[PDB]
Amino acid sequence: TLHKERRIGRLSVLLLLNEAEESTQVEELERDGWKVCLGKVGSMDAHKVIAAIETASKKSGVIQSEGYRESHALYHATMEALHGVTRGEMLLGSLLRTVGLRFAVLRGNPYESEAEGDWIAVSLYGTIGAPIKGLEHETFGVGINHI
Amino acid sequence: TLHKERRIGRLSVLLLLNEAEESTQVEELERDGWKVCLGKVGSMDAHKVIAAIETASKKSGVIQSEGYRESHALYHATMEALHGVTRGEMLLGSLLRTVGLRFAVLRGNPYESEAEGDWIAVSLYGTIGAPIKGLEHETFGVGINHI
Amino acid sequence: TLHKERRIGRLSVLLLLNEAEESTQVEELERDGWKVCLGKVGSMDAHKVIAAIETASKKSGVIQSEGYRESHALYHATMEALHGVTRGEMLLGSLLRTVGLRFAVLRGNPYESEAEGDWIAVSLYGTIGAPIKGLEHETFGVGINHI
Amino acid sequence: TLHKERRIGRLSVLLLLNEAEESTQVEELERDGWKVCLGKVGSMDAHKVIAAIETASKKSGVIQSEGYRESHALYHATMEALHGVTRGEMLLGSLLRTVGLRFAVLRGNPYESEAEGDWIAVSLYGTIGAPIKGLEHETFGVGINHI
Amino acid sequence: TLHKERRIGRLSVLLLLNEAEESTQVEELERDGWKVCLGKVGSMDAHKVIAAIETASKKSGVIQSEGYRESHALYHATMEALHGVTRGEMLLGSLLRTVGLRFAVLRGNPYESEAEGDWIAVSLYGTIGAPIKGLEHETFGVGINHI
Amino acid sequence: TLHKERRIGRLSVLLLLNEAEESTQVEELERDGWKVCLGKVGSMDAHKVIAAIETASKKSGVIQSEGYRESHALYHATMEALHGVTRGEMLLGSLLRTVGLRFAVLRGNPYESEAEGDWIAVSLYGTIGAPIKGLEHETFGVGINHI
RNA sequence: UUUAGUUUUUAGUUUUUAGUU
RNA sequence: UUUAGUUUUUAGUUUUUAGUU
Ligand SMILES: N[C@@H](Cc1c[nH]c[nH+]1)C(=O)O
Ligand SMILES: N[C@@H](Cc1c[nH]c[nH+]1)C(=O)O
Ligand SMILES: N[C@@H](Cc1c[nH]c[nH+]1)C(=O)O
Ligand SMILES: N[C@@H](Cc1c[nH]c[nH+]1)C(=O)O
Ligand SMILES: N[C@@H](Cc1c[nH]c[nH+]1)C(=O)O
Ligand SMILES: N[C@@H](Cc1c[nH]c[nH+]1)C(=O)O
Ligand SMILES: [Mg+2]
Ligand SMILES: [Mg+2]
Ligand SMILES: [Mg+2]
Ligand SMILES: [Mg+2]
Ligand SMILES: [Mg+2]
Ligand SMILES: [Mg+2]
Numbered sequence: 068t069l070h071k072e073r074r075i076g077r078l079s080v081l082l083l084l085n086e087a088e089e090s091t092q093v094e095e096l097e098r099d100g101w102k103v104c105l106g107k108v109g110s111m112d113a114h115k116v117i118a119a120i121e122t123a124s125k126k127s128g129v130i131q132s133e134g135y136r137e138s139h140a141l142y143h144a145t146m147e148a149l150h151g152v153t154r155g156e157m158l159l160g161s162l163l164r165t166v167g168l169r170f171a172v173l174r175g176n177p178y179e180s181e182a183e184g185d186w187i188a189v190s191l192y193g194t195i196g197a198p199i200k201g202l203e204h205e206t207f208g209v210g211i212n213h214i
Numbered sequence: 215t216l217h218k219e220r221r222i223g224r225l226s227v228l229l230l231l232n233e234a235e236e237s238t239q240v241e242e243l244e245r246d247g248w249k250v251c252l253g254k255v256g257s258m259d260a261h262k263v264i265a266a267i268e269t270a271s272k273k274s275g276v277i278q279s280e281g282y283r284e285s286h287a288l289y290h291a292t293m294e295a296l297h298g299v300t301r302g303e304m305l306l307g308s309l310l311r312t313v314g315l316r317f318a319v320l321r322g323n324p325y326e327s328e329a330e331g332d333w334i335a336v337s338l339y340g341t342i343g344a345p346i347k348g349l350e351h352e353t354f355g356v357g358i359n360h361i
Numbered sequence: 362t363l364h365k366e367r368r369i370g371r372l373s374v375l376l377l378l379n380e381a382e383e384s385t386q387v388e389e390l391e392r393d394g395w396k397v398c399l400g401k402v403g404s405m406d407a408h409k410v411i412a413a414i415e416t417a418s419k420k421s422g423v424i425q426s427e428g429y430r431e432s433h434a435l436y437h438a439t440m441e442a443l444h445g446v447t448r449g450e451m452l453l454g455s456l457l458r459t460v461g462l463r464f465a466v467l468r469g470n471p472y473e474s475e476a477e478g479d480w481i482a483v484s485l486y487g488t489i490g491a492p493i494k495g496l497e498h499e500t501f502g503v504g505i506n507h508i
Numbered sequence: 509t510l511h512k513e514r515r516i517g518r519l520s521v522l523l524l525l526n527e528a529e530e531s532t533q534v535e536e537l538e539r540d541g542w543k544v545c546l547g548k549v550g551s552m553d554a555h556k557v558i559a560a561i562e563t564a565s566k567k568s569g570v571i572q573s574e575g576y577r578e579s580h581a582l583y584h585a586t587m588e589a590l591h592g593v594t595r596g597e598m599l600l601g602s603l604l605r606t607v608g609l610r611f612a613v614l615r616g617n618p619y620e621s622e623a624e625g626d627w628i629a630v631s632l633y634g635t636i637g638a639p640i641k642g643l644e645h646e647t648f649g650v651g652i653n654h655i
Numbered sequence: 656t657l658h659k660e661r662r663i664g665r666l667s668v669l670l671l672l673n674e675a676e677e678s679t680q681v682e683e684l685e686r687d688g689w690k691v692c693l694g695k696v697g698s699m700d701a702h703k704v705i706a707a708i709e710t711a712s713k714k715s716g717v718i719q720s721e722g723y724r725e726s727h728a729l730y731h732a733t734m735e736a737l738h739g740v741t742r743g744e745m746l747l748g749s750l751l752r753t754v755g756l757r758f759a760v761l762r763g764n765p766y767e768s769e770a771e772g773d774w775i776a777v778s779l780y781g782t783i784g785a786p787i788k789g790l791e792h793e794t795f796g797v798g799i800n801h802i
Numbered sequence: 803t804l805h806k807e808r809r810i811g812r813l814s815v816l817l818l819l820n821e822a823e824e825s826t827q828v829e830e831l832e833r834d835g836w837k838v839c840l841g842k843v844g845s846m847d848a849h850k851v852i853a854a855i856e857t858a859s860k861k862s863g864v865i866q867s868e869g870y871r872e873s874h875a876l877y878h879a880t881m882e883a884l885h886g887v888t889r890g891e892m893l894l895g896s897l898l899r900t901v902g903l904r905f906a907v908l909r910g911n912p913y914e915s916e917a918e919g920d921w922i923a924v925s926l927y928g929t930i931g932a933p934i935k936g937l938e939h940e941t942f943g944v945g946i947n948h949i
Numbered sequence: 950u951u952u953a954g955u956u957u958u959u960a961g962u963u964u965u966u967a968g969u970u
Numbered sequence: 971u972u973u974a975g976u977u978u979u980u981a982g983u984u985u986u987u988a989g990u991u
Pocket of ligand 3: 457489490
C-alpha cells in the first residue's frame with residue numbers, strides 16, 4: 068500500500084510545478100528522508116535530456132555513481148517519463164521538434180512497508196514544439212521505478 | 215507565445231493534485247474564463263477511461279455535445295494523456311494491469327494571441343498496478359490539443 | 362526497378378477508390394496477369410478485419426489455401442496496412458473506436474525483372490471513429506510484401 | 509456525416525495518384541473551395557519530409573504562416589500520414605532506409621454540417637527502400653486532422 | 656562488468672533450449688546459487704502468459720510472494736521478454752494470433768561485483784501463428800531487470 | 803508443421819550461444835542443407851547493425867546479392883530481431899545506449915513440407931548499455947521470415 | 950560485416966524524389 | 971502456472987477509482 072503522505076510521484080510533480088522564489092521545498096523533502104535533485108535541460112536530442120538527468124542525479128547524490136544497478140533503475144525511469152513527453156515516438160530533432168524542460172528526481176520509499184525499499188521518480192515539465200520560439204505547447208512525463 | 219498566467223497544462227495538473235475540502239479552484243478558473251471538468255474512473259479497460267472523460271466533458275459543457283470537431287480534439291488529447299499513463303502499450307487488462315484515476319479537462323486559450331483560439335488539456339493521475347490492491351504505483355499523463 | 366505500368370500499390374489503391382458502377386477494372390487487371398480480390402468489412406475488432414481479408418483472399422484464389430508461406434506473407438502485409446489505418450496503436454474497440462472498410466488484395470510482380478517473383482499488396486480505405494454514426498473521418502492503409 | 513462529394517482523404521489521394529499533363533484537378537478543387545498544395549520530397553531524414561510539407565503548405569496558403577494553431581494541426585496530420593509510410597518505427601536513415609515521395613495537402617470541410625469547420629488531409633505516396641536504386645517498394649500514408 | 660560464468664541471459668536461454676538435460680541443469684544452477692523456475696503456457700491472451708510466469712515464479716520461490724518490489728521487477732522483465740515475442744504490438748488474439756511457449760525465470764547476480772545485487776531474466780521460446788495448428792513459426796524473447 | 807529436427811530459430815540461437823563448438827557446428831548445418839552466416843557488430847547506430855548483417859549475409863551467400871526479393875526478406879527479419887534487442891524503441895545512440903552483438907543468419911526450410919520453401923532466421927545476442935564499459939546487461943533478438 | 954562505449958544546470962527556422970553496407 | 975488454436979462480403983452510444991494469476 069502507498070503511504071498517503073509519501074506519494075513520490077505526486078511530490079516530484081508538485082516540486083517541479085512550484086515557482087515560489089524562496090521555497091525550501093527541497094529542504095522539507097530532505098528532512099523527511101527523501102533524496103532530491105532539480106534541473107533544467109533543453110534539446111533536440113533525447114540523449115542530451117537523458118544525460119542531464121543522470122549527471123544531475125549522480126552529482127547531487129540521488130543515485131550511486133558506482134556500479135550499474137542504480138543507473139539501470141534511473142535509465143528505465145527516465146525512459147518511462149519520456150513516454151509522456153514524446154507521446155508515441157521517442158524522437159525530437161528527427162521529427163522536427165525540440166523540448167525545453169525542468170526535471171525532478173525523487174528517491175525514497177513511498178509505501179507503508181519499509182520492506183518495499185527505495186523507489187525513484189523522474190518528472191519532466193516544459194514545452195515541446197517546432198524549432199521556432201512560440202510554436203510550442205506544454206509537455207509532461209513521470210516515470211517511476213524500484214531502486 | 216504561451217501566456218505565463220494561462221499555462222493550461224500546468225493549471226490542469228495543479229487542479230488534479232490539490233486535495234482541499236473547501237477549494238473552489240474550479241470557481242476561480244471559471245472566473246478566469248476557463249471551461250473545467252473533474253472526474254474519477256478506474257478500470258481494466260482503456261475504453262472505459264476514454265468514455266468517462268468524454269461523457270464528463272460533454273455533460274459539464276467543456277466540449278460541444280453536437281458534431282464531431284470537438285469530440286475529435288478531445289479524443290486525441292485523451293490518447294496523448296494515455297501515453298503517459300501506459301508508457302508503451304495502450305493496454306490495461308490484456309497486460310494484467312488496472313488503473314484508478316482522477317482526471318481534469320481544461321479548455322481555453324493559453325497563448326498571448328487571442329487568435330490561437332481554444333485549446334484543451336486532459337490530465338490524469340492515479341495508480342496503475344497488478345489487479346491486487348497495493349501492488350501498484352503512481353501514474354500520470356497529460357495530453358494537449360487545439361479545439 | 363519497379364515497372365512503371367505494374368505499380369501494385371498504386372493499382373490496388375486506384376481499384377479501391379473507384380466507384381464506377383460498371384467497372385470491369387478487375388477484368389483488365391486479371392487479363393494483365395494479376396490475381397485480385399475486393400471486399401468490405403466493418404468492426405471494433407481488428408481480428409475480424411484480418412480474418413475477412415484472409416478469407417476473401419483464399420476463397421478468390423489470390424493466395425494458396427494450403428500451407429503457411431503465403432498466409433504468412435499476407436498476414437504481414439495486412440499488419441502493415443493496418444498501421445496506416447490505426448496510426449500508432451493497433452487497437453479499435455479497446456480504444457473506443459470502430460472502422461468500416463473496403464479492401465483490395467493484389468498479387469503479382471511489380472518489377473522489371475521476372476526474377477523478383479510475386480508480391481502482394483493489401484489496401485484499406487474507409488472510415489474510423491467513435492461508435493456513433495457520423496463521428497468519424499477517413500482512414501487508409503497499404504501494406505506490401507514478397508510472396 | 510461525411511458529405512459524399514467532399515471526402516477530403518479520398519480526394520487528396522486521387523490527386524496524388526493521377527499523372528495527367530494537362531490536368532487542372534487543382535483548378536477544380538480550388539473552384540469547389542478547397543485549399544490545395546502538391547509537392548515532392550526524398551530523404552533519409554524524416555525531419556526533411558515534415559519540413560517540405562510544412563514549407564509547401566505555408567507558401568501555397570494552405571495553412572496560415574502566422575501563429576501556432578494551424579501549424580499544430582498540420583504537424584499532427586503529417587505524423588499520422590508518416591505512420592502509414594514507416595509502419596512501426598518513424599525512422600528512415602537510422603534504419604538504413606530512404607524514401608522518395610509525392611505529397612498532397614488538402615484543406616476544407618468534408619462534412620454535411622458547415623459547423624464542422626475546416627479539416628486537413630496530408631497524403632503521401634512513393635517508394636521506401638534500401639539506399640540503392642531499385643531495392644525499394646511503394647509506400648503510402650494519409651493523416652487527417654481538424655484545423 | 657558481467658561475470659563470464661554468470662551470464663544470466665545466456666544461461667536462461669540454454670536452459671530453455673535443451674530438452675535433453677533439464678532435470679540436472681536446474682540442479683546445477685541451484686547449486687551455483689541461482690533461483691530457477693521453468694514452465695509452459697499457451698494462449699491467445701497475453702495476460703495469461705504474464706500470469707503463468709508470475710504464478711510459477713512465486714510458487715517456486717524465485718521471487719517473494721509478499722510485497723510489490725519483486726513483483727514489479729518481474730512484471731517489467733516479462734514485458735521486455737514479450738517484446739521479442741510480439742515484435743511491435745503486444746497483442747495476440749486481437750491480431751488473430753496465438754502462442755505456445757516454454758519459459759524460464761532465473762534470479763541471481765550476473766556481475767563481478769556483489770554490490771550489483773540480484774537481477775532477473777525471463778526467457779520465452781515457442782511458436783506464434785494463426786489459430787490453426789501448423790500455420791506458425793518460432794518466437795523468442797528475453798527480458799532482464801534488477802531485483 | 804515445423805519439422806522437429808529443423809527448427810531454424812532454435813538452431814540459429816544454439817549456434818550463437820556456443821563459443822565452444824563453432825567451427826564444426828557450421829560444417830554440420832551446411833551438411834544438412836542450411837545456408838549459414840556468423841558475425842559480430844557493435845554500434846550506437848542501428849543502421850550499422852543492419853548493414854553488417856546484410857553485408858555478411860550477401861558475402862557468405864546466405865542470400866542473393868542480386869535483386870530485391872531476398873534483401874527485402876532479410877531486412878524485415880532483421881527488424882524483427884531488433885525488436886527483441888531494443889524492446890520498444892528501435893533506437894540506440896539517440897537514447898544514450900550502445901550494443902555489442904554476435905549474430906547468426908540461417909536459411910532453409912524448417913517445415914515438414916518442401917512446399918513451404920526457404921525461410922530465414924536472424925538471431926542476435928550480446929549486451930546493451932550506457933556508453934561506459936560494464937554499465938550493461940545482456941540482450942537477445944530473433945526474427946523469422948519467408949524467403 | 951569482421952563487439953560498441955564518458956553525460957547537467959531550458960531547446961529552437963525548414964519545400965520543389967531519396968540513395969552503397 | 972502446469973503449450974495455444976478454424977476466419978469474408980462496412981462498423982457503431984460511453985462518467986462519478988480499478989482489482990486475484
Ligand atoms: N505539437 C507537437 C510538437 C510540434 C512539432 N512541430 C510543431 N509542434 C507535439 O505534440 O509533440
Ligand atoms: N508496474 C506496472 C504496473 C503493474 C502491472 N503488474 C504489476 N504492476 C507499470 O509500470 O505499468
Ligand atoms: N479520430 C480517431 C477516431 C475516433 C475515435 N473517437 C472519435 N474519433 C482516429 O483518428 O483514429
Ligand atoms: N522494405 C522496407 C524498406 C527497405 C529497407 N531496406 C530494404 N528495404 C520497408 O518495408 O520499409
Ligand atoms: N507470422 C506472425 C504470426 C501469424 C499470425 N497469422 C499467421 N501467422 C508473426 O510473426 O507474429
Ligand atoms: N538498460 C538499458 C540499457 C542502458 C542504457 N543506459 C544504461 N543502460 C536497456 O534495457 O536497454
Ligand atoms: Mg535495461
Ligand atoms: Mg483522428
Ligand atoms: Mg511472422
Ligand atoms: Mg502537439
Ligand atoms: Mg511499473
Ligand atoms: Mg518492406
